[PDB]
Amino acid sequence: ASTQPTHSWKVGDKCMAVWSEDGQCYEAEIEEIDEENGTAAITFAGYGNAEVTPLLNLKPVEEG
């Protein structure tokens, strides 16, 4: 138990994640979820970078 999910995420979903390097949000796809830690491994689309970031950092892709 680490991050208590406030959002329900599934593998292969598009989300926006906060890049650990800039702290800004970027579009990323969930590759793997760890519900215990409340984290998901996401891959930033276009760049190809991937990081394990808590579901709390994952935001829905709101196009506006």
Ligand X SMILES: CN(C)C(=N)NCCC[C@H](N)C(=O)O
**What is the contact surface with ligand X in residues (CB under 6 A)?**
19, 26, 44, 47, 49
**Shortest Å, Cβ 51 to ligand X:** 8
Q: Which long-range contacts (CB under 8 A, 24 or more apart) does 37-46 make?
A: 37/1, 37/2, 37/3, 38/1, 38/2, 38/3, 38/4, 38/5, 39/2, 39/3, 40/9, 40/15, 42/15, 42/17, 44/17, 44/19, 45/14
Q: Which is nearer to ligand X, 9 or 44 (CB)?
A: 44
Judged by beta carbon, residue 36 or residue 62, the one nearer ligand X is 62
Distance in Å, CB of 22 to ligand X, minimum: 7
